[PDB]
Amino acid sequence: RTPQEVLKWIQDENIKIIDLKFIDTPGIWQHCSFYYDQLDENSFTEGIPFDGSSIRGWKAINESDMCMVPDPNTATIDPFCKEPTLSMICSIKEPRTGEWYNRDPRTIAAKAAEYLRGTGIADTVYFGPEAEFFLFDDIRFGQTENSSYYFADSVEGRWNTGREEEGGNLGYKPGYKQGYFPVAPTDTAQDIRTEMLLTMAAFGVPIEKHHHEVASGGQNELGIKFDKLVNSADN
Amino acid sequence: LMIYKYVIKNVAKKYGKTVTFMPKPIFNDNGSGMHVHQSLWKDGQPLFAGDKYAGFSQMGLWYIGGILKHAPALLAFTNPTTNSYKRLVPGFEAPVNLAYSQGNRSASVRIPLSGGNPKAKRLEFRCPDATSNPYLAFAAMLCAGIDGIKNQIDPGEPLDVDIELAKIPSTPGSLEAALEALEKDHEFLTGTGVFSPDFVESWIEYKLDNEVNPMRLRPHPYEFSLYYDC
Ligand SMILES: Nc1ncnc2c1ncn2[C@@H]1O[C@H](COP(=O)(O)OP(=O)(O)NP(=O)(O)O)[C@@H](O)[C@H]1O
Ligand SMILES: [Mn+2]
Ligand SMILES: [Mn+2]
Ligand SMILES: [Mn+2]
Q1: Following DSSP, what letter does each residue of B148-181 receive, concatenated?
Q2: Which residues bind Mg(2+) 2 (chain A)?
Q3: Is A20:A90 a contact under the CB 8 Å cutoff?
């Protein structure tokens, strides 16, 4: 896809809002939404302004102004927006120099793939990440001067086999280290994992599989295909 | 021992508390055992004092012989509950292994370290627990002891180690197993006249009908932990 094809997309489908996404230094996705008329051909080169001093590990208040440059190849509809919203992944431009920002993790990533091509060893590096997670029903944490606490909860949690539940306690709570990978009613996350897998596919992610993981109390994993460095970190 | 058990229970009740002498009330923590020290004496003199192993006499070694040889049968009287076998489990904390040793608190029979005093020379049978009838448990252990001197049972060689392990004879793993060992080996009790064959038979019958069989019938909560999904 190209800047013009994305602009034609917005005009044809009457998309009113654009959600531009970009990563910060530690690894948290940041975003800013814009009314359709704010995105033109120049947004894909010069970028859109923002405060680079409120993003962790970036600019200092005195040299704050930065630019968001969206990638046309990342455009899809964000399903989590009631209002049909087009979403794009950005890279960060330094407005002072006009060059890509040296602290932008997505710039570093592109530079790494540019370096590989420069050595003559290879032209492509394929990365296949396998990120396990926990699906919790509750989380309570805090720490004051006289306290420190965390309380994680899940219906699958083995620590909950003797508890009174609303109408009532249906058993089948996986045992510790025994979640990989008994069927339902032990596995309570089949429908949700399929939804997680199918919705990210519509976002442009190459999808493969899904399974319940070793841990009791919601450990899960979704399987996605490898891709080129930047594409894989985008995925 | 009966007074001991009575005052403890009653002072606990006085202070609004409750006492149990059951071997294993708490899982993954120490059980309640009744280690029983014993020694034979004649004309005021200690007969278990000598120049053999751990400062013991040949008679003392022989008394241990009997105890160790008759230990599985002795357990029908010294450990007479299904719960006894939750404490007498290999590992936590022993004494599952039928051997004598000095200082070793992992052996069935322990010879405590006496301060060079003949009067303090004795064996500690560690297997018993406080669910036993002390009158029956003590009479039984005496009988096995005497038979050991009279036959003249070699206790074997001491085991001075912590924790191949199949080389050493083991105690019964259940109440029925101890009751089986009593049916096979009860002549050291009966032939004496102390216990009647009538009593020995009624003991096995009462324990099977009122404890072994009712227990086999009842589902255990941990069976839900292991088997609810299947
Ligand atoms: N030649 C390759 N280069 C890079 N990644 C690859 C390559 N081939 C496969 N992969 C990816 O590596 C990931 C591995 O998933 P999978 O095929 O299940 O291997 P796995 O080792 O059995 N997974 P796991 O059991 O959790 O360790 C997927 O993203 C694959 O697409
Ligand atoms: Mn995994
Ligand atoms: Mn996998
Ligand atoms: Mn002791």
Answers
A1: HHHH-------------TTSS-B--SSHHHHHHH
A2: 132, 213, 221
A3: yes
CB A64 within 8 A of CB A52: yes
Q: How was this structure determined?
A: X-ray
Ligand located closest to A206 CA:
1
Ligand nearest to the CA of B104: 4
**Surface of B (141-200) touching A: CB under 8 A:** none
Contact (CB<8Å) B229/A161 = no
Report the C-alpha gap between B37 and B33 in whole angstroms: 13
- Please tell me what resolution, in angstroms, this structure has: 2.8
B38, B141 contact by CB (below 8 A): yes
β-pair partners for A92 = A68
- Chain A to chain B, count of Cβ pairs less than 8 Å apart? 8
Q: DSSP characters for B76-123?
A: HHHS-STTHHHHBBTTTB---B--EEES-TTSSEEE---SS-GGG--E
B119 is in an annotated binding site: yes
Task: Name the β-bridge partners of A87.
Answer: A19, A76
CATH number, residue A40: 3.10.20.70
* Residue ranges making up the domain that contains A11: 2-104
CATH top-level class of B1-218: alpha beta
Examine residue A114 and say whether the peptide bond preceding it is cis (omega within 30 degrees of 0): no
Q: Which residues contact A188 (CB under 8 A, 6 or more apart)?
A: A155, A156
Q: At what angle do helices B197-207 and B58-78 cross, to 10 degrees?
A: 50
The values of phi and psi at residue B75, to 5°, are -65, -20
Burial A115-144 (b: 16+ CB within 10 A, else e): eeeeeeeeeeeeeeeeeeeebeeeeeeeee
